[PDB]
Design a protein around this ligand. Sequence first.
Ligand SMILES: O=C1CC[C@H](N2C(=O)c3ccc(N4CCOCC4)cc3C2=O)C(=O)N1
Ligand SMILES: [Zn+2]
Ligand SMILES: [Zn+2]
Lengths: 374, 35, 799
Amino acid sequence: DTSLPTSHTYLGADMEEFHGRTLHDDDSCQVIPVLPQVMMILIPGQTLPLQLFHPQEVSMVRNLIQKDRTFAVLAYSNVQEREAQFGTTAEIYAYREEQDFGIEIVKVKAIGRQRFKVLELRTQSDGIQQAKVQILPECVLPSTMSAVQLESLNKCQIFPSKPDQCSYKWWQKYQKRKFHCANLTSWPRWLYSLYDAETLMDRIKKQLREWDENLKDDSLPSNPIDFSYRVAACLPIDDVLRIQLLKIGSAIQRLRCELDIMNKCTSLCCKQCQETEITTKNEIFSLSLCGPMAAYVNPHGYVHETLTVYKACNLNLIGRPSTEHSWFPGYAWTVAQCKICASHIGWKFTATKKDMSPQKFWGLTRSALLPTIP
Amino acid sequence: LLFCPICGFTCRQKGNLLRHINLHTGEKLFKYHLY
Amino acid sequence: MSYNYVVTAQKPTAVNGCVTGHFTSAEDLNLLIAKNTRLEIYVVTAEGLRPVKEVGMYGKIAVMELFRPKGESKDLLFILTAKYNACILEYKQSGESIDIITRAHGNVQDRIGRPSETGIIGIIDPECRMIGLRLYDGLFKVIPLDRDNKELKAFNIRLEELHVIDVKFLYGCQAPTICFVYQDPQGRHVKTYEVSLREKEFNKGPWKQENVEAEASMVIAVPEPFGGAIIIGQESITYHNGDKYLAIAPPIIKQSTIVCHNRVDPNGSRYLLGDMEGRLFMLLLEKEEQTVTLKDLRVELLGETSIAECLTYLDNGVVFVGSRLGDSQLVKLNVDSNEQGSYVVAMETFTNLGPIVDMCVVDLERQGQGQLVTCSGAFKEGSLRIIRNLHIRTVPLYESPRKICYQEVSQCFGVLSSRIEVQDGTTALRPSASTQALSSSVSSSKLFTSFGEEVEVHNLLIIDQHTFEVLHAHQFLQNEYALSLVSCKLGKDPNTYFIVGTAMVYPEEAEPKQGRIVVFQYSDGKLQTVAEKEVKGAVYSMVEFNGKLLASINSTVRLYEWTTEKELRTECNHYNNIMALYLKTKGDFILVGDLMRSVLLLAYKPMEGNFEEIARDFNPNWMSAVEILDDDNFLGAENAFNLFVCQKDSAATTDEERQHLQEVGLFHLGEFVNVFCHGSLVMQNSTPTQGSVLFGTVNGMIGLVTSLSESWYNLLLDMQNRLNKVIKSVGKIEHSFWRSFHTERKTEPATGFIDGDLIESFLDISRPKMQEVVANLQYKREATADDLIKVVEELTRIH
Ligand SMILES: O=C1CC[C@H](N2C(=O)c3ccc(N4CCOCC4)cc3C2=O)C(=O)N1
Ligand SMILES: [Zn+2]
Ligand SMILES: [Zn+2]
């Protein structure tokens, strides 16, 4: 079942949810609070689970819930110095309170909504930080052939519908019909296909299906912007690449960059070692509907972006299979360390009953992985 | 079985507990995480 | 800021619209032709076409319709521009003076709205009660056609159908009725609505919705007594009128898509149809009396013409074929076919340079006056055009020419060409330049379907510069796409070579993985393959860089050197993470650009033997061409038919500023620029302008960009501002609005560009108008009409 991870059942039972989605006007200037403990780079449309214990941030969340349910997640370029040029607004869409261990705890789940630029960063006297936010817009470009088009051929630009057989031939027909007027320019049709939204989404869909057997077409957004953000949220890439993707404002350019990453970045090595290969892009399998990767929260509230892989090497096992707070139900986890540098890489999930498939796999933290081009 | 609060690393002694925790890359925001 | 000056050496020649009516007078039969920004009015005569007027519009004519509201003695012309300037114009003649009056005008744009994927549609009710416009999906704009609506006030009506293919106003309807074809997830359907001006809404149409062919694309409103409508798709032609329904599936039309039509008989008994491959058919509506009703439909293949953008039947079997891909035609329809079975006989040909996909400047006669050799047309209309100061010579090729370069030493042009063949082994559709060459060779390199599918065969043609015969034709490997072509010497080799970059293209591969750089030598009538290099990508562009070869392989820029063994040796590489589609050089500077307007300026370091990035400017937008005006200024063609200029400030005192190419000039050209090239068509050998860059566009326009001084630019900007207050535009479109850098939901004022056409128009205005323009103009001394006349004449002499 690929839908279980997205529900974050590990947090608890049904959580109070808010359907009041809110979006600020493009280019608008806002003032947004920043949660001090969050050190993750959030892509729009990406889910972020959180566990708050500190009284200050608990109070901040409580106040936010009553006003806009929105807070800023900063893409820290200099984490130690807390210098961030860009960030993402995150809207709280689920919230619950708990009194475990005789201590107040707040369990939350937010979703990234809009990228933005950082203008000012003011630290409040109560330990909370506020940011002057410039809501970035979505650079939307017209079809490449819109400018160079023939009035007679303006009709027949709407294809009947989308039914290799009946697909590759359909795509050949689509290229021939959509970029016919490419004969009026100095470039071929197949070159304009490399900048076409639909073709790029189709190629990315082929790759994702290669990563997921049960990936139905409807599961992905039909909008190029949302599709590009969804793809970016599930790529095993480092932080620098994630920031670079966030900077790109054009859906076409984002899709092209994502395709480049997926076609070139095939190895995943230890971040600290920089050379100890840990796995390859072929071993990635999607056990979550959101993608091969998903964010989870451990008991102490730390956020781990786990990527699931069939096989992993150069890993030493610490502890013994324990099912406590296991992110994937029915699987007992055991700590995995880099065989060379001993740095924690993830957890090996082993089956508890022999009827489960797969019988074993690994979940590697994204922050501990470096994508490498062989 | 001192449990590391980040990854779940387990050990019975103490020194290796720090030897693991300080090996983690980040600020670790302990005041915001430890129960 | 930059100071540039743009002129039109050749006005657009591609025909995008054509209508027939009674515009100049109630008795004269007039033909109106819309060529992008030009409107030509001819009087149809037994001897052909008599030009009566030619007008320039501050806009791209998208809709052009003739209508005669009650009380008018002759037709009025409705014109909509691509910027949504609508105008109702009248032809007023007084003695020998002709002027186009603007009966009404206004902008019909909407703040919000997505332009329809099927483009702008403009129709007029047969009773001239309203004008209907389809500009955005889900909306239908109605302009009441009352005489008090002098500002063309319009109102929107919501359309529940968002994917509308075609729409027409029906004849013989008590209330304004529209019949349109629209696509839903089920398929294509024909629907009808009644437009209510009082309620400003739609009411149930005269007949219920019907299902039509999945490829139904064309709607024809048949006039009385038939009424009803005809739906034309890729397989069948159907006629719907109330409960009456008729359908035919003539096989002849299945070979190609019918894209244009025109009504021959005023009662609708005959129609002209034109396909995408240049075939012309006649559709005949058999008539039977009961009132009168339609009996049968039949289609006859009249013959072959130039690929028709539009058709219009004038009289006496004469048809004007307006073509975008080739010369426009005036043909005669004969009652009886000739020996070949063709009823069509060509009477006149009208030159069309567009599309200009590439061009070069060469001084063939060697007098210091250059000539422009352009690759014009496409498919069977492809050809070479030789343009000199404006005499034009045509060399038909019958296949698409893509690139051209001139080899002075061998006195020949190297032309990359493409021809379409049908898999059946492949068979050529017709003889062409690549197949009729004197000598021929086929690529034979060790490196590296269905019946009916079309394939592209790429050739390099060596063409004599005097006779323009195809001296040689070399065919490239199967699936090989030749993208770039240069002619130059390399290293210490005294020989001159044709160097071709190619990519291996397969349908299953989104991006090419293999490619070739081939070095041929044309000597003593033979084209020999001197050298061959295999690369892992598409060689999009190539240039000669100080005796080396600078090539663009996918997203890499690679400098090769020509060794004494006559082989290409990699000198250095640079990785740009953008496909280097456009590659230009000057001195040691290299300009790299991709299709998304990303610009990157590198510099070659001879001592380090590698490239370093000098500057960068990334701004998502479609870019069709770039050029290097000088060491600091770079000219490019941007989406929405714009020109832009980027400037480099090396002495900026800041690393951030030194690495930014600020845009210092924008100008809405109205043309899709395909190629830039340094050169001039005027005799050379104090001048007010520096440099000269010709550019060729899709519509066949040739333009020239030159550089002015600050003083001259200021004077000419003042002159423009003064002229705009005196010259009256057709349709009352403001010049500043017309030239404002335009984009979908964005418009910036033009800057850094002097509209050469507006300045040149200063010589045509009358003396009182000249006095008004020059009044209180500071030359120190107050400028006088004579001084400005001299200045404008000097400017005109540059082309
Ligand atoms: O899949 C999984 C396994 C890994 C991950 N995780 C941790 O990082 C962690 C750290 C300390 C933990 N203890 C706290 C003290 O006493 C009991 C156990 C437990 C976990 C844990 O499940 C998780 O939450 N879910
Ligand atoms: Zn390591
Ligand atoms: Zn740990």
